[PDB]
Design a protein around this nucleic acid. Structure first.
Ligand SMILES: [Zn+2]
Lengths: 218, 82, 71, 206, 129, 82, 132, 101
RNA sequence: UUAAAGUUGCUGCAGUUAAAAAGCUCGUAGUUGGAUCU
RNA sequence: CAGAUACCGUCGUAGUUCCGACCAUAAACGAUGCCGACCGGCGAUGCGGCGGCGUUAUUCCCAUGACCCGCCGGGCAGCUUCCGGGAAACCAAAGUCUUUGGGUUCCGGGGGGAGUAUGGUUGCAAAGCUGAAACUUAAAGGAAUUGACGGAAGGGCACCACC
């Protein structure tokens, strides 16, 4: 049974925060995976991307652990990407699913040409890098699909992007760096100032300040 | 840093800078007005002057040149022009 | 850096066609010295007459006898 | 003190500042802190401006007062010149002190025993206790720091230009911050002076 | 030596939006800089600027908003027919929704959206978004 | 952000920094939202209402967070002029 | 050699911290109370806890110790910390300012302060350490 | 890859530095690459400092000293244990050792 | 043979250590050239 | 020394030195083309200029020197830093780069064959410049990690080590 150990967990468990977007708006870190299970939960879906054996030399042979790269997310929503390394592959997969739940970001989705209906693509051209792998996303017309390699395609489909042109330079064969670069490119959708986000920000209370009187009862 | 005022520098901030690196180039020199004590004349001399400036009447020296600023001789007083 | 003027196309077009020659895929198909060295002469197949059956040995980490034919 | 004559510096407080020596900075200057300086005299010692100092206390006291829960401010000193001054500031105000050694992971490691989550950090010497400063930048903590002239302003948010080397000048600054937090709150106000002497906040050398 | 005064006066104001400043100095100013800066200002990217007149060649102090992502120059000023503007604004701009290409037509230094209305080609000067 | 129908297509609208107009990201944990109380005008006690400032983490890592909160308080009229 | 492991020292520290009134200096009456307080598997550990306690009780008379915390010292430090003098050390009738400090006070319109006694400034500009 | 930043040398902004020998090996190492050492010791070893003073026909006779400057090479300094290998982070600390006792 | 090949690169590559900056300087052609005129 | 046609020691021609010709190459290195703009701090240093307490000498005064405290300009460098880059080591340039365009020269295209063969040219020669292909290979290689090894150091231990 969940017993929350942070102020944010005590607020989420007691129904005091009504969405994940409040926790995103006030930029707060998430330290418990059951917050993501509380909000998204039954709509989240994960895929293990790679199980990678790594080997430390000792004087008695080689010591072997297994890293697992787990992508996760809600189609139309959010995406995570976690890497855990352990002595057992099931333990690595479970720790990687926890780590992929905790690194869940929101993706901003825009339109290619005319603004009719719901968003479908990236808002602008965003890039993302991880150690000599660049990934660039380009906005695409309604219905072209993700035009990309198979490994960023899982992350872009889990994000809820329906169509996108892509390009990758670098040693994309190292799958962890290629996963960790398209995740970086779809993180920069919500930190790019387009001219509709030029309105002056109207501030509201932090969750820690709004519920400072319920948080002393516990 | 990160919010200075470049339109309006302070008057000590203007005088610190190089004469070409100010907001508008101002020269660092002037024209003095040297009075030789042994005579009664008035001879306008540049401050950073080169080779020597002799009086027309007494035909003696006023300022021998130096590296930057021409040094006056002894007894020669000066009142700066405006 | 690269030249970047607006009247620099002769420097650009002729730097490339000298730099194209250091491409071994380019050179082996444009120099002509490796198509007079090819036994076919740029055909997909060819015919011949078997001289003898020499069988030649496999390379290092794996052992067998590859049976060949001297044509 | 936004041109309010109720909050202006009185004649007695400057006598306290000059008797403790808060106006005397170090022998160096950070480039962030040149705004708070008056001039450098002979023998190198920079003279800290005091109309600038009194406005940074009253900015910081507004920051502390604007927190509802009085025990969400976390008040920290690692040098022993501010370890009595912090337990007595947190006694009269209501804050939570960490005097002594700040073990790392106090704000990040949620499994730990000494885990707490403040809403505002007050430290005493950003050269010395940098480890609560860099650990604040993982958990979104605004930060007051009682800052000297040669003490760098990375991750601090409103750094009071005081002299944090002398033992009297630290205790007086904590006394002024406690006084202004209590006065700007609902407690005993600006007419009669505070009966808690500032010598309570000083450091006792054996 | 200083070939291209508009190049050094845009990477002066590019490098200071990175560093977070609120004002740039850009010496020297030509009048192609003041026309380019007025196009960025009219689309809300820059804000008000002041032309300091020494007798040599002016300097400009530009007040910056925090709204400019990138400011760029194209070198050389290639000629752009109006039937070839789509390739240019697909190679240089981040989306179909924002960002402008500045080109110098015979009707004046303008955007690409203005140059489409007045039906004019020109030479590409640069871009901003 | 809006379609032709005027409806809002956004998960949320992020807050920008009060100093530099940079978007404060979702996982930018070095960022600040700081409340500064307003005092009563004649007695100097806590009014109830406050001013809010947000500082992005890159400015705060630069060390320019002290002189940003200060000159944002000087424009809101909390710090007295000079 | 004779070093006490973490078991002896941890047990001795808790049994000092909880039962300081019964412990004294005699190892023998320390052993007779350490076998009535605690449940130790027997003697060769019981006499090692009671010996570090007998070495640790002599260490408390000479001052505090950096581990345990006992409430005969931590009331005396409390009454030592709530100590105010009669007239404060900031009530000086003649306080010394520089020439330039008085100029800052005149900027702050505190030139009418009467207690300030401006000192003669230092004649030499000699403050840097002799490098080399 | 570059192990030192000054290339194990003190040449910063000239072309050629003159070559001098080594004292032990006699190896032509350049002047800002030789390990240098200045010794100030007494000319008679300190065991015989009493017996030089009893046989002194002069009163309070001062003791002259040896002043030689030693330019060891790089190879034979580490052999002679006058200079050593340090850590990757102690390599950047060019302060002299605490000789003052 | 074309794409994949941003492994010929105008768009659009590289040149400290992976292949690579001429020992240094002068210099004609080429290439490129500061403000300023309703 | 098993063997030394080497290390080590003793002699010792050309050379090492001076001048007239040639040679034009080096780990000729910062292994980093030149010109230009913008971009963090700090303390020193060399040269020149400007301002300033107060100490020495030219007997006291001026001027100069020697210091002391700053400021400006250009230099060889250094420390530092979440400026940003980079595969990293690291670099305030190796930054301002998929948000890619300031001007311009040289030059690289997997490893070998090979800087070889041939041809031309320069030179008294030695050699220098210019410079292939046939064939042959699935890797050669860069940074960094963890062991292992060292006739590398510092320390520590053992009568299955010594004394
Ligand atoms: Zn040697």
């Amino acid at each position: 049974e969940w017993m929350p150990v942070t102020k944010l967990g005590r607020l989420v468990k007691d129904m005091k925060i009504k969405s994940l977007e409040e926790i995103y708006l006030f930029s707060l870190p998430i330290k418990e995976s059951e917050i993501i299970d509380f909000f998204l939960g039954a709509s989240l879906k994960d895929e293990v991307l790679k199980i990678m054996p790594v080997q430390k030399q000792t004087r008695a042979g080689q010591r072997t652990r297994f890293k697992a790269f787990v992508a996760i997310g809600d189609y139309n929503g959010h995406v995570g990407l976690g890497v855990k390394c352990s002595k057992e592959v099931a333990t690595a997969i479970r720790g990687a699913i926890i780590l992929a739940k905790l690194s869940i970001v929101p993706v901003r989705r825009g339109y290619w040409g005319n603004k009719i209906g719901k968003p479908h693509t990236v808002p602008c051209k965003v890039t993302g890098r991880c150690g000599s792998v660049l990934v660039r996303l380009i906005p695409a017309p309604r219905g072209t699909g993700i035009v990309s390699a198979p490994v960023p395609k899982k992350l872009l489909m889990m994000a809820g992007i329906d169509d996108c042109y892509t390009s990758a330079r670098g040693c994309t064969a190292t799958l962890g760096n290629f996963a960790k670069a398209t995740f970086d490119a779809i993180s920069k959708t919500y930190s790019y100032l387009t001219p509709d986000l030029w309105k002056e920000t109207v501030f509201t209370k932090s969750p820690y300040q709004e519920f400072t009187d319920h948080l002393v009862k516990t | 840093p990160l919010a200075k005022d470049l339109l309006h520098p302070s008057p000590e901030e203007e005088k610190r800078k190089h004469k070409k690196k100010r907001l508008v180039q101002s020269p660092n020199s002037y024209f003095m007005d040297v009075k030789c004590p042994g005579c009664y004349k008035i001879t306008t001399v540049f401050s950073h002057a080169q080779t020597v400036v002799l009086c027309v009447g007494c035909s003696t020296v006023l300022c021998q040149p130096t590296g930057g600023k021409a040094r006056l001789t002894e007894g020669c007083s000066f009142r700066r022009k405006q | 850096g690269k030249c970047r003027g607006l009247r620099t196309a002769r420097k650009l077009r002729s730097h490339r066609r000298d730099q194209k020659w250091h491409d071994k895929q380019y050179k082996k198909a444009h120099l002509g010295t490796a198509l007079k060295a090819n036994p076919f002469g740029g055909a997909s197949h060819a015919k011949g007459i078997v001289l003898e059956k020499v069988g030649v040995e496999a390379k290092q980490p794996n052992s067998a006898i590859r049976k060949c034919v001297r044509v | 003190s936004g041109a309010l004559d109720v909050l202006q510096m009185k004649e007695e407080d400057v006598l306290k500042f000059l008797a403790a020596g808060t106006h005397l900075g170090g022998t160096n200057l950070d480039f962030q802190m040149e705004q708070y300086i008056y001039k450098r005299k002979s023998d190198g010692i920079y003279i800290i401006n005091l109309k600038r100092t009194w406005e940074k206390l009253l900015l910081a006291a507004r920051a502390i007062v604007a927190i509802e829960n009085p025990a969400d401010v976390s008040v920290i000193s690692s040098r022993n010149t501010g370890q009595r001054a912090v337990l007595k500031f947190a006694a009269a105000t209501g804050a939570t002190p960490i005097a002594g050694r700040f073990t790392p992971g106090t704000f990040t490691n949620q499994i730990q025993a000494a885990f707490r989550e403040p809403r505002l950090l007050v430290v005493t010497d950003p050269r010395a206790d940098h480890q609560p400063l860099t650990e604040a930048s993982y958990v979104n903590l605004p930060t007051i720091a009682l800052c000297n002239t040669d003490s760098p302003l990375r991750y601090v948010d409103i750094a009071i230009p005081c002299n944090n080397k002398g033992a009297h000048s630290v205790g007086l600054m904590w006394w002024m911050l406690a006084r202004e937090v209590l006065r700007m709150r609902g407690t005993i106000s600006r007419e009669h002076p505070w009966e808690v002497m500032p010598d309570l906040y000083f450091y006792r050398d054996p | 030596v200083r070939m291209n005064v508009l190049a050094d006066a845009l990477k002066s104001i590019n490098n200071a939006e990175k560093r977070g400043k609120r004002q740039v100095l850009i010496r020297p100013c030509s009048k192609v800089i003041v026309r380019f800066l007025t196009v960025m200002m009219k689309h809300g990217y820059i804000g008000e600027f002041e032309i300091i007149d020494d007798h040599r060649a002016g300097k400009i102090v530009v007040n910056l908003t925090g709204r400019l992502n990138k400011c760029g120059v194209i070198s050389p000023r290639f000629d752009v027919q109006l039937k070839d503007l789509e390739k240019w604004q697909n190679n240089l701009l981040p989306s179909r929704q924002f960002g402008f290409i500045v080109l110098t037509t015979s009707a004046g230094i303008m955007d690409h959206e203005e140059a489409r209305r007045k039906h004019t080609g020109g030479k590409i000067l640069g871009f901003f978004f | 952000m809006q379609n032709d129908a005027g409806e809002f297509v956004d998960l949320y609208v992020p807050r920008k920094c009060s100093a530099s107009n940079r978007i404060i990201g979702a996982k930018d944990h070095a960022s600040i939202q700081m409340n500064v109380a307003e005092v009563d005008k004649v007695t100097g006690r806590f009014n109830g209402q406050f001013k809010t400032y947000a500082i992005c983490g890159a400015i705060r890592r630069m060390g320019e967070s002290d002189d940003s909160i200060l000159r944002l308080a000087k424009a809101d009229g909390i710090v007295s002029k000079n | 050699g004779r070093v006490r492991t973490k078991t002896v020292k941890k047990a001795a520290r808790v049994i000092i911290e909880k039962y300081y009134t019964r412990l004294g200096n005699d190892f023998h009456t320390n052993k007779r109370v350490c076998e009535e307080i605690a449940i130790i598997p027997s003697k060769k550990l019981r006499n090692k806890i009671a010996g570090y306690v007998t070495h640790l009780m002599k260490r408390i008379q000479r001052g505090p110790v950096r581990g345990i915390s006992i409430k005969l010292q931590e009331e005396e430090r409390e009454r030592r910390d709530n100590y105010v003098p009669e007239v404060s050390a900031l009530d000086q009738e003649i306080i010394e300012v520089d020439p330039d400090t008085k100029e800052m006070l005149k900027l702050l319109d505190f030139g009418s302060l009467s207690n300030l006694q401006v000192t003669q400034p230092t004649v030499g500009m000699n403050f840097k350490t002799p490098r080399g | 890859t570059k192990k030192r930043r000054n290339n194990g040398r003190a040449k910063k902004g000239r072309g050629h530095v003159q070559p001098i020998r080594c004292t032990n090996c006699a190896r032509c190492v350049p002047k800002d690459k030789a390990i240098k050492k200045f010794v100030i010791r007494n000319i008679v070893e300190a065991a015989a400092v009493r017996d030089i003073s009893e046989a002194s026909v002069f009163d309070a006779y001062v003791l002259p000293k040896l002043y030689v400057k030693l330019h060891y090479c790089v190879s034979c300094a580490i052999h002679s244990k006058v200079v050593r290998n340090r850590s990757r982070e102690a390599r950047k600390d060019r302060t002299p050792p605490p000789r003052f006792r």
